């Protein structure tokens, strides 16, 4: 009677940057629902394709827990059919996404008075990301006609930038920890039930 390790994802001490989002593969365990919506007025909670009150009555093949951090103005991009610097170049959700999105203000954890520049995001990419694609590439982005050859110069810029989470910023700029739960159901034996 192994319980699904949901505490390791929400109560994790450090989240990953958005461009290298972490995914915890959860299966063969006793799930739960209550905490999900019942909990308390904590954060954002949006489900797509499934109802939270019905999660306890459904069995799934695998449940994927994606966790990362972005700023406030970008939480709306973690949703099916969204565009933007986060949705197109960091973490894209499919149009037929079946799952829920959870995001809370973690200004008290991930923002320092001198700026917490450890959290990074991708700024330049030649094409859009497919759903559930993780690009950790750090190659010099060629924005011009001449090749870069690993030379940071004109029309050759580094593809990552830092978030600067300072607690004195506006709420649209404060760090937000995001937890995305994907519910998959394919031709397989279902193991992630919650009763």
């Amino acid at each position, epitope marked *: 009677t192994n319980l699904c390790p949901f505490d390791e994802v929400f109560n994790a001490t450090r989240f990953a940057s958005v461009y290298a989002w972490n995914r915890k593969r959860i299966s063969n365990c006793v799930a739960d629902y209550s905490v999900l*919506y019942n909990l308390a*007025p904590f*954060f*954002t*909670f*949006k*489900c*797509y394709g*499934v*109802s*939270p*009150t019905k999660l306890n009555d459904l069995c799934f093949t695998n449940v994927y827990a994606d966790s990362f951090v972005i700023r*406030g*103005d970008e*939480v*709306r991009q973690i*949703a099916p059919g969204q565009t933007g610097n986060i949705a197109d170049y960091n973490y894209k959700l499919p149009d037929d996404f079946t799952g*829920c999105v959870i995001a809370w203000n973690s200004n008290k954890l991930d923002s320092k008075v001198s700026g917490n520049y450890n959290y990074l995001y991708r700024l330049f990419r030649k094409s859009n990301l497919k759903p559930f694609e993780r690009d950790i590439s750090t190659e010099i982005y060629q924005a011009g006609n001449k090749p870069c050859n690993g030379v940071a110069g004109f029309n050759c810029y580094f593809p990552l930038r830092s978030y600067s989470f300072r607690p004195t910023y506006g*709420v649209g700029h404060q760090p937000y920890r995001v937890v995305v739960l994907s519910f998959e159901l394919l031709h397989a034996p279902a193991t992630v039930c919650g009763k």
Partner: nanobody
Amino acid sequence: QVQLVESGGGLVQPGGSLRLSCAASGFTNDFYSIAWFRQAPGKEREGVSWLSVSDNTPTYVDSVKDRFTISRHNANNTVYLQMNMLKPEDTAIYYCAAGRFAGRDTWPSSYDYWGQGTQVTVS
């Protein structure tokens, strides 16, 4: 197509009550959620109450917990916000918003459908 019709505001004394109503139109099914945002003088839009329709699950911020009640009447597809024991803090323009999801958000930009605000003054 989709449209939100708001009503119910007015002037009230501290301690009084008020009932806001939001009528949701061009929705195919019951898979949407309603949120109430109030805009105090000089403040940003802030969520106060949410309802996931398909689940019939309510959520209220702590400052309004026992004073506000949200509910839905099925036939007229209208969500009601019963505001009791009103305080001067509650003075704001209130908006209802809808989104194609089951849940709730603090971010206004996350709701694609908005009604026109109704004025609530408590003094």
